[PDB]
Amino acid sequence: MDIILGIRVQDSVILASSKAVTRGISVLKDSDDKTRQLSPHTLMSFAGEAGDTVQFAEYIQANIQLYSIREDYELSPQAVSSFVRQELAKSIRSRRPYQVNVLIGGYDKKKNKPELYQIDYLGTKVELPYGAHGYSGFYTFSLLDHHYRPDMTTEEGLDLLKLCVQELEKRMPMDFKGVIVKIVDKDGIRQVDDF
Amino acid sequence: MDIILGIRVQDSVILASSKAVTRGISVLKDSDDKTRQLSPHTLMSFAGEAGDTVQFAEYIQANIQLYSIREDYELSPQAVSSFVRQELAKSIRSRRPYQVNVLIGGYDKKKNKPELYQIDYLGTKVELPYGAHGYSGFYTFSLLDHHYRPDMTTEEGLDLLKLCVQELEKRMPMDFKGVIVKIVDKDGIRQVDDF
Amino acid sequence: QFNPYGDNGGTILGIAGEDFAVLAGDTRNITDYSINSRYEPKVFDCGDNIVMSANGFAADGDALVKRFKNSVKWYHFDHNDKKLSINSAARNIQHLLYSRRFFPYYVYNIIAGLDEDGKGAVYSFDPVGSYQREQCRAGGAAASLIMPFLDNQVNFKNQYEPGTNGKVKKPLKYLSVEEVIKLVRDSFTSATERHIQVGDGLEILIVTKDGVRKEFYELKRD
Amino acid sequence: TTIVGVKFNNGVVIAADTRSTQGPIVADKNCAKLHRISPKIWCAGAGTAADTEAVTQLIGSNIELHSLYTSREPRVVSALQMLKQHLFKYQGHIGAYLIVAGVDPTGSHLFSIHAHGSTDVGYYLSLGSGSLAAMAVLESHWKQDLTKEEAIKLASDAIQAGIWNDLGSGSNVDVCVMEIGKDAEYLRNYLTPNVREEKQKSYKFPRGTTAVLKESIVNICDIQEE
Amino acid sequence: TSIMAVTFKDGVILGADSRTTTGAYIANRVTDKLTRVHDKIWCCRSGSAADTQAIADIVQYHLELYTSQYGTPSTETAASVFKELCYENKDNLTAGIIVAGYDDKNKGEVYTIPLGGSVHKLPYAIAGSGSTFIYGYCDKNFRENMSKEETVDFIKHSLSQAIKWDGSSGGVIRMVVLTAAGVERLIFYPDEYEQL
Amino acid sequence: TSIMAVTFKDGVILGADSRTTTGAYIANRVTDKLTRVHDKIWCCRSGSAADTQAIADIVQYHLELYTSQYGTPSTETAASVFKELCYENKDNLTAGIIVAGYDDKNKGEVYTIPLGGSVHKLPYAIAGSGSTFIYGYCDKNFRENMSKEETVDFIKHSLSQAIKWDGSSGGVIRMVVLTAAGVERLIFYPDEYEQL
Amino acid sequence: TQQPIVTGTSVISMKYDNGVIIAADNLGSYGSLLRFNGVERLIPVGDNTVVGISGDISDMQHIERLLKDLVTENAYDNPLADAEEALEPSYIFEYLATVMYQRRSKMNPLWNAIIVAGVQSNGDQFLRYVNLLGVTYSSPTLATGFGAHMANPLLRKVVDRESDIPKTTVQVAEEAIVNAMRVLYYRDARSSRNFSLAIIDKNTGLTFKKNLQVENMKWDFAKDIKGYGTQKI
Amino acid sequence: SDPSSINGGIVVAMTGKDCVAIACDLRLGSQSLGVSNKFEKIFHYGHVFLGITGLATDVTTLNEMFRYKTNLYKLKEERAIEPETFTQLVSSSLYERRFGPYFVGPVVAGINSKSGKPFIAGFDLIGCIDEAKDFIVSGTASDQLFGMCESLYEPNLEPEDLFETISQALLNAADRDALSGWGAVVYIIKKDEVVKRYLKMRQD
Amino acid sequence: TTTLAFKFQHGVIVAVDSRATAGSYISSLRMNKVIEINPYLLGTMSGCAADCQYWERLLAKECRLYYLRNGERISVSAASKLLSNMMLQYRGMGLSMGSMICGWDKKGPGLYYVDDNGTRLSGQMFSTGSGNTYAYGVLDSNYKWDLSVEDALYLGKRSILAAAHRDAYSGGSVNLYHVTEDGWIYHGNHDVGELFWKVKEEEGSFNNVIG
Ligand SMILES: *[C@@](C)(CO)[C@](*)(O)[C@H](Cc1ccccc1)NC(=O)[C@H](Cc1ccc(OC)cc1)NC(=O)[C@@H](C)NC(=O)C1=CC2=CCC=CC2=C1C
Ligand SMILES: [Mg+2]
Ligand SMILES: [Mg+2]
Ligand SMILES: [Mg+2]
Ligand SMILES: [Mg+2]
Ligand SMILES: [Mg+2]
């Protein structure tokens, strides 16, 4: 799939992901949710080759859920991101690599801090205040570089995110059918139903 | 460029053409008029390779205007379409062919009839009640096949045209930035400023 | 580079009657512009009142038929000499073909016989294993020459009743075995005229409740 | 295509089959592959059918004008030279492979010519997809000092070999005999061994079978008086 | 193809096989590869038959026109005309020609013109696909100022071996003798040369 | 490369040049291409030096093990081991080997194993890039049951011509004589064989 | 996947009233080089079968060994090895055809075209073809390579269909085969004068003829042929 | 990509007793997309009829070209062109573009006004003439038309019988070709009257 | 091909064409592109015919085994997933399959799109094949949740007709299905040739076509 954005504000992480799914010259779906909850306080959005994306995301989800049950304990966003990176770095030298790029947004309950990790299909991990995959960053990073502060509220984060989507909608040749926005904070994961 | 539509109703011809112009991954313009007036009662919209389109359209325009001055007489839409076809058929076997597809909408003042001609870059001419170029027809022709009557008013033609654009906007992966609509009738050529 | 496939030409035709079925095919075998044999049987009696022909690449065609004949033999061993019905044979053949999905049997296969209600049955296959029951099917080199003629003369397509002018269709009356054989012979005579890979001889296998009968007819040898 | 050329005592004979193909499909069952360059100079062509015709007509036209200019009957060597220089110039892009034969005041001649412009001389020649089948017959039965009747037999036997054994060849046998001091005799359909058998059924339809929407008279006459 | 030209006491002899192939099919088994560009200037052709025929025809034209104006041309002059055509059109030609001729002044001369269009004057020359197999034999058995009969035997034995090993070569052995006496054509059939 | 093996009255002689090239550069001008796989079974190698060395080493291993169990192997047996390796690994090898050996029962035998892995028993054999130029010479000059001195001269003259025309061949001419008397190595330098 | 190196050309054959005839030349070509002149490409199996092989010679030698081993294996625990349970042409052919098709299915073919000629227990003539693709067919006449293009047309003039077989004698059939071999020598650049011929008859058994030569060749007419068009001398 | 099968279409001609028939489908497409169901492929210059299949731009171009040439022929000769003569004109005109050809499959049909003899002919894209007695076929369903014509055709058919034969040959061939159909037209031609009939067929 | 399927108030409609092509040659005039996996489960077929038949018939085996083990009908969601996992085993091996798994289960009516890449999508309306764009045009403009069974069957029928007309690789006949909570119901085979002329007259559509 195409556009996935992420921003880490004062007390939460916000992930925005496009709704479009294309097959041939036809848009099959305009309400697709390109994300999986890995744990109560960890969300992963994804984008890449068709089929591979969901298979990889669900495989990661299953592994983290297995860990949670075994230890009766939630892994930190940092620990989850490292596990995901290793799986991708393992994958890139396989016979048929998984062509999937991910953003991992989580709230660390121990440190009381939001955390955003950007990982590409090669297994290239970076912790960032805001991130994107593919061409999304080419349009949006200039706005984020300008407007972003680390003490922003969740509401201010959403307003800056709207501005990024508006710029994408103006300058991209691609109709991605808007975005689904989800917030990750101390209370867990929730979806912004009006955006 | 991408989408150009045409429909011939009772007493007029309506041409709809996209506003987008793309260069690389950036939309440079969202208000581009992909059309040239060849004569007071003849309009030609165009779509194809960058640069070639406007050069061809203006070259045709110059030739028809030259004819109009020389004879003090407006060529029929049929005569103009045949002239355009010959230029394209001449072009396709040239060293470097002009990759341009056109729709010619005209009102014949002699016969008191609207006329729509579809001509592709090979020089393939067809007179039609409604037409399109590229992928535009794949989405729209089913609607036109269903709803079109030959006794439709200009207002009904515009309503059916809106439905075609709405279907394009829903099922195309491509953001073409809406359309400029122009009407060709006995009184000449005018633009619908609100669409 | 080694090309494991080849084209042995030939053409086959299966027609399902009301209480019978025919499977016909020419006896010419070729490579490029040469004739290998003027009489190389292509339609086989596989037992259990089933006839079969695998047209295209002869080596793959012989291999498939050989394996199906084997499948019939083992079906008797494993299931107390039960008769293999035409629909069961058809489904079995699908799995034989798809076992080579990634290195296909380069053949267009047709089988013919009687269904469990005693009616005429023809099943047709693609190289990778898609199949379906049909009334009429031509396969191979001159398939495109023959099929339209059968649409017209077997199913009465585009034929209407005089006087009505397109309002009433020609009714779909059933064809006898003598009538079908006439259409088969004319189909191959016409195919022989306009297709260089078709000729030499025509062999027809007719299936009824009484068994499998054979008929042979000469074709032009040029 | 199968074509041959055979020399004999007092002249030369050429022959050809009558099948033309579009890949595996037979377009024409009675094609005429024996072309006339001049009255007593005939050629027969394989390869690209339009090229063999066009190149034969062109050289034949120029040969006629040459014959008129020189007040002499055309020679086979002139046709040969004009053909090869034309074909050589187009470097094989004109796919004409011809057997050229004829009689002139110099005597009887038989040449082959290939698309790139090379020519050969012989007493017996064969070209086309059935050349190998035909040449097998010629090598088996050809001899020096053949009579007219023996040469026609040998030529047609060579074409038959191509008809029966080559899929690119079929139908009938055409022959042209060019003897010294005589008019050339073109024997169209000299043999007819591939007549289609009677069909088992007549497919003549009842009148009214086909559904019709509109009928109209077509005006083919010019604009009328009064 | 197997072609050669050999100088001897009284003049020069050209020799060749008679096989023309299209792949493995023998299109002509009685080809005449010894071609005349002037009364006593002949050439042996190898490579594209279309190219070598077209060249030899043009050369024959040039030497006919030369003769009308300036008298009988030298063998060196003939080889120069061949060269000029083979060299200037090297990108569009595949021709390997051996030129051989007799003057009363210069006697027997042999020139070889390989693919590039270079010219090399030699006592004897060999060319064609079958020449590879007789480089050793010809080098060991060639002598200068041989007799006519010795030279005929030399060419016969040499081409016999070339034909024996090269599939592209075969048929009859044709020879052309160029002396003051005139022009003599020779032919030797398989039953003669195979048993050598 | 120019290699050959020739049977004669008293046994068999292997011969070879000594040039190894990498393109036009002579990587080694004193190569020993005559290699021993058993006491009186030797081979001449052509093609990839890596492939032919690896093969000859494996064959030497097989014949050493054969001898320990079953006694002295035949020349036919040695050629069979070569063949089995050359044939079964034909897709990954470029090796043209001539096998030559002496028994008291079978006397001198020569087997050639070209690229495909086929085996051909012969009175004499030639191989390598330079062999092409001496097919005619060797065919004309070979006789059965020659003397040792006649056979040495035959190989010397033959390889002399191969070296003369083939740029990939050259250096010294090495020879190995295989008889009941034993194993004799010979060498012939340029100043000797060039003036033949 | 490979490419053929040392090759053998046409193998030709035909049925006659009491048996079959098969023939093939003794040449082993190395591209355009006529390298080996003493190669036997007809390989008898018992006294009732002859296998004729064209194509790659190294693969031929491999097949030759498989057949030699097949005879050995058939004799094991078989008191009727020289009688009722002897190898039949149909057994030998089907074995080879199985091997050829398996090898092509592994993309590692035996680069050959094979004709198995013989006579069965009941006196019936056997003649069938198989090649590197595993393609099999039978006909009154069979030929490989150039033989298919030049020999079959000549042999089919003698036996055009099945009903002509009883009318064809061994003398006529042998004459046709020998004539075909001459025509191939005229026209196949990869052929030789020396050849082998085998007759398997239901009465007189297996007759194997070696060191045959093409004779009665026409070359005299070559003397008159001059130039390539206009040349007179 | 293949110019001879982008637009699709078919043409067939037949001889009868003192008559000829020529017919064509009406489809014009851009590969899979059907664009027009009124694209007639048969034209006439006087009493000589020409059907053209293949690349639509070249069909249109050649019609305009043969109209041009036949109108001049008539002005100079003071008579209408005959089918035999026109056939040679088509062949000449196509071969003059030997190395940059029109991607077409023309079919000539007509009756000689002097001899009264029915005439048909076909060409390849490069000008090679096929002068058949029985029938001529051209287009994307040429294989289908050969099979139908070869089995349905019989010589010396009367105009109203010939109509049924040619119509059924076209219709059923078109129904086994994805790129042909969307309507059909049949011309029945006699020495001094010509009838044109539009057939009813499936529109898929 | 052209296939479609959509959910609505009274279940789910499934409509497909019946054409099969081998290049430009129409190999089959009437091919069944629906598979009946069980009384409450359907599967559409687009792409390679062999791949569609084999894998969906293999899905029915696995859906049947589910019933025997659990004594309960498999869900549409689970069935579609099993199929998508099969496609994921032969990942990049060259399979061509596009199908819609239609049925009724405990959650109500269910519709899932599944293709050779492994993509698995839940949705109200889908259309696959070369003529899907033409079908979407009619569907999008006329679809409602409040459709009657009679009008819904017509919509899916009319949508295929639109595609069969324009798309050269779609046609033959229309096969209709209606899925209820009591199972699927076959609503016949409809020839396009006859259906076209009928719809033209009754509806007034296809004005540009002459008849
Ligand atoms: C549209 C026709 C696409 O053009 C549909 O998508 C159709 C779907 C479909 C048909 C039948 C059954 C189920 C689904 N697709 C095809 O028909 C399909 C298109 C195609 C072809 C090839 C590939 O890559 C391998 C992908 C997609 N066509 C086929 O599968 C062709 C090969 N079928 C035949 O040619 C064929 C011949 C035949 C003879 C007898 C019986 C069956 C036969 C078939 C299916
Ligand atoms: Mg157009
Ligand atoms: Mg035929
Ligand atoms: Mg030779
Ligand atoms: Mg159609
Ligand atoms: Mg359609």
Side-chain angles (χ1 to χ4, degrees), chain A residues 74-87:
Chain A
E74 187 174 15
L75 278 167
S76 67
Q78 194 290 127
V80 173
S81 70
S82 295
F83 173 80
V84 169
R85 195 205 80 81
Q86 187 181 56
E87 290 295 312

PDB file of all heavy atoms in Angstrom, chain A residues 74-87:
ATOM      1  N   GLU A  74       3.637  -7.092  29.408  1.00  0.00           N
ATOM      2  CA  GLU A  74       3.693  -6.401  28.123  1.00  0.00           C
ATOM      3  C   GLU A  74       5.119  -5.946  27.820  1.00  0.00           C
ATOM      4  O   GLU A  74       5.730  -5.234  28.622  1.00  0.00           O
ATOM      5  CB  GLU A  74       2.751  -5.195  28.126  1.00  0.00           C
ATOM      6  CG  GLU A  74       2.613  -4.507  26.773  1.00  0.00           C
ATOM      7  CD  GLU A  74       1.562  -3.411  26.767  1.00  0.00           C
ATOM      8  OE1 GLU A  74       1.125  -2.985  27.857  1.00  0.00           O
ATOM      9  OE2 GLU A  74       1.170  -2.972  25.665  1.00  0.00           O
ATOM     10  N   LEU A  75       5.643  -6.358  26.667  1.00  0.00           N
ATOM     11  CA  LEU A  75       6.961  -5.907  26.210  1.00  0.00           C
ATOM     12  C   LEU A  75       6.952  -4.409  25.939  1.00  0.00           C
ATOM     13  O   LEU A  75       5.946  -3.857  25.490  1.00  0.00           O
ATOM     14  CB  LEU A  75       7.389  -6.638  24.932  1.00  0.00           C
ATOM     15  CG  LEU A  75       8.008  -8.028  25.084  1.00  0.00           C
ATOM     16  CD1 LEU A  75       8.084  -8.723  23.733  1.00  0.00           C
ATOM     17  CD2 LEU A  75       9.389  -7.950  25.719  1.00  0.00           C
ATOM     18  N   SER A  76       8.080  -3.759  26.208  1.00  0.00           N
ATOM     19  CA  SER A  76       8.235  -2.339  25.915  1.00  0.00           C
ATOM     20  C   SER A  76       8.234  -2.117  24.401  1.00  0.00           C
ATOM     21  O   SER A  76       8.638  -3.007  23.649  1.00  0.00           O
ATOM     22  CB  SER A  76       9.537  -1.806  26.516  1.00  0.00           C
ATOM     23  OG  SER A  76      10.666  -2.379  25.876  1.00  0.00           O
ATOM     24  N   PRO A  77       7.782  -0.931  23.947  1.00  0.00           N
ATOM     25  CA  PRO A  77       7.823  -0.595  22.518  1.00  0.00           C
ATOM     26  C   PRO A  77       9.211  -0.774  21.897  1.00  0.00           C
ATOM     27  O   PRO A  77       9.320  -1.179  20.741  1.00  0.00           O
ATOM     28  CB  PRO A  77       7.419   0.880  22.490  1.00  0.00           C
ATOM     29  CG  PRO A  77       6.600   1.073  23.714  1.00  0.00           C
ATOM     30  CD  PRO A  77       7.163   0.142  24.747  1.00  0.00           C
ATOM     31  N   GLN A  78      10.252  -0.471  22.666  1.00  0.00           N
ATOM     32  CA  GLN A  78      11.633  -0.643  22.217  1.00  0.00           C
ATOM     33  C   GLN A  78      11.943  -2.119  21.954  1.00  0.00           C
ATOM     34  O   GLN A  78      12.531  -2.465  20.927  1.00  0.00           O
ATOM     35  CB  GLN A  78      12.601  -0.073  23.262  1.00  0.00           C
ATOM     36  CG  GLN A  78      14.034   0.109  22.779  1.00  0.00           C
ATOM     37  CD  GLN A  78      14.770  -1.202  22.563  1.00  0.00           C
ATOM     38  OE1 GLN A  78      15.332  -1.435  21.492  1.00  0.00           O
ATOM     39  NE2 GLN A  78      14.760  -2.070  23.574  1.00  0.00           N
ATOM     40  N   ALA A  79      11.542  -2.981  22.885  1.00  0.00           N
ATOM     41  CA  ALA A  79      11.759  -4.422  22.751  1.00  0.00           C
ATOM     42  C   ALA A  79      11.014  -5.005  21.548  1.00  0.00           C
ATOM     43  O   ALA A  79      11.558  -5.833  20.817  1.00  0.00           O
ATOM     44  CB  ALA A  79      11.344  -5.141  24.026  1.00  0.00           C
ATOM     45  N   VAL A  80       9.775  -4.563  21.348  1.00  0.00           N
ATOM     46  CA  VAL A  80       8.957  -5.014  20.220  1.00  0.00           C
ATOM     47  C   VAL A  80       9.582  -4.574  18.894  1.00  0.00           C
ATOM     48  O   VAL A  80       9.669  -5.364  17.952  1.00  0.00           O
ATOM     49  CB  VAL A  80       7.509  -4.478  20.319  1.00  0.00           C
ATOM     50  CG1 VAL A  80       6.707  -4.808  19.066  1.00  0.00           C
ATOM     51  CG2 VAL A  80       6.810  -5.049  21.546  1.00  0.00           C
ATOM     52  N   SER A  81      10.015  -3.316  18.832  1.00  0.00           N
ATOM     53  CA  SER A  81      10.624  -2.764  17.620  1.00  0.00           C
ATOM     54  C   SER A  81      11.900  -3.511  17.229  1.00  0.00           C
ATOM     55  O   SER A  81      12.151  -3.739  16.043  1.00  0.00           O
ATOM     56  CB  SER A  81      10.921  -1.270  17.792  1.00  0.00           C
ATOM     57  OG  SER A  81      11.984  -1.052  18.702  1.00  0.00           O
ATOM     58  N   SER A  82      12.694  -3.889  18.227  1.00  0.00           N
ATOM     59  CA  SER A  82      13.913  -4.670  17.998  1.00  0.00           C
ATOM     60  C   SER A  82      13.591  -6.073  17.481  1.00  0.00           C
ATOM     61  O   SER A  82      14.285  -6.590  16.605  1.00  0.00           O
ATOM     62  CB  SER A  82      14.746  -4.763  19.280  1.00  0.00           C
ATOM     63  OG  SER A  82      15.219  -3.485  19.672  1.00  0.00           O
ATOM     64  N   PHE A  83      12.543  -6.684  18.030  1.00  0.00           N
ATOM     65  CA  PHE A  83      12.081  -7.991  17.560  1.00  0.00           C
ATOM     66  C   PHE A  83      11.636  -7.909  16.099  1.00  0.00           C
ATOM     67  O   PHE A  83      11.979  -8.772  15.290  1.00  0.00           O
ATOM     68  CB  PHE A  83      10.933  -8.515  18.434  1.00  0.00           C
ATOM     69  CG  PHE A  83      10.294  -9.770  17.907  1.00  0.00           C
ATOM     70  CD1 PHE A  83      10.890 -11.006  18.110  1.00  0.00           C
ATOM     71  CD2 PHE A  83       9.099  -9.714  17.203  1.00  0.00           C
ATOM     72  CE1 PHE A  83      10.308 -12.165  17.623  1.00  0.00           C
ATOM     73  CE2 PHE A  83       8.511 -10.869  16.711  1.00  0.00           C
ATOM     74  CZ  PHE A  83       9.116 -12.097  16.922  1.00  0.00           C
ATOM     75  N   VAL A  84      10.877  -6.865  15.774  1.00  0.00           N
ATOM     76  CA  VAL A  84      10.398  -6.644  14.408  1.00  0.00           C
ATOM     77  C   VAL A  84      11.557  -6.396  13.445  1.00  0.00           C
ATOM     78  O   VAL A  84      11.573  -6.943  12.343  1.00  0.00           O
ATOM     79  CB  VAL A  84       9.394  -5.471  14.346  1.00  0.00           C
ATOM     80  CG1 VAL A  84       9.098  -5.065  12.907  1.00  0.00           C
ATOM     81  CG2 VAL A  84       8.102  -5.851  15.051  1.00  0.00           C
ATOM     82  N   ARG A  85      12.519  -5.573  13.859  1.00  0.00           N
ATOM     83  CA  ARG A  85      13.685  -5.275  13.020  1.00  0.00           C
ATOM     84  C   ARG A  85      14.451  -6.549  12.670  1.00  0.00           C
ATOM     85  O   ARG A  85      14.806  -6.768  11.508  1.00  0.00           O
ATOM     86  CB  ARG A  85      14.633  -4.289  13.708  1.00  0.00           C
ATOM     87  CG  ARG A  85      15.647  -3.663  12.755  1.00  0.00           C
ATOM     88  CD  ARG A  85      16.903  -3.188  13.469  1.00  0.00           C
ATOM     89  NE  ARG A  85      17.828  -4.287  13.750  1.00  0.00           N
ATOM     90  CZ  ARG A  85      18.688  -4.811  12.874  1.00  0.00           C
ATOM     91  NH1 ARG A  85      18.766  -4.359  11.626  1.00  0.00           N
ATOM     92  NH2 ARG A  85      19.481  -5.806  13.251  1.00  0.00           N
ATOM     93  N   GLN A  86      14.700  -7.382  13.678  1.00  0.00           N
ATOM     94  CA  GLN A  86      15.436  -8.630  13.486  1.00  0.00           C
ATOM     95  C   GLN A  86      14.743  -9.557  12.492  1.00  0.00           C
ATOM     96  O   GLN A  86      15.406 -10.210  11.688  1.00  0.00           O
ATOM     97  CB  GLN A  86      15.621  -9.366  14.814  1.00  0.00           C
ATOM     98  CG  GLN A  86      16.526 -10.584  14.706  1.00  0.00           C
ATOM     99  CD  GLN A  86      16.683 -11.318  16.023  1.00  0.00           C
ATOM    100  OE1 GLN A  86      15.697 -11.732  16.636  1.00  0.00           O
ATOM    101  NE2 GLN A  86      17.927 -11.495  16.461  1.00  0.00           N
ATOM    102  N   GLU A  87      13.415  -9.619  12.563  1.00  0.00           N
ATOM    103  CA  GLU A  87      12.634 -10.435  11.632  1.00  0.00           C
ATOM    104  C   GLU A  87      12.760  -9.935  10.195  1.00  0.00           C
ATOM    105  O   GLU A  87      12.824 -10.737   9.266  1.00  0.00           O
ATOM    106  CB  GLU A  87      11.159 -10.475  12.047  1.00  0.00           C
ATOM    107  CG  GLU A  87      10.898 -11.261  13.322  1.00  0.00           C
ATOM    108  CD  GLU A  87      11.220 -12.738  13.186  1.00  0.00           C
ATOM    109  OE1 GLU A  87      10.784 -13.360  12.194  1.00  0.00           O
ATOM    110  OE2 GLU A  87      11.910 -13.279  14.077  1.00  0.00           O
TER     111      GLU A  87
END
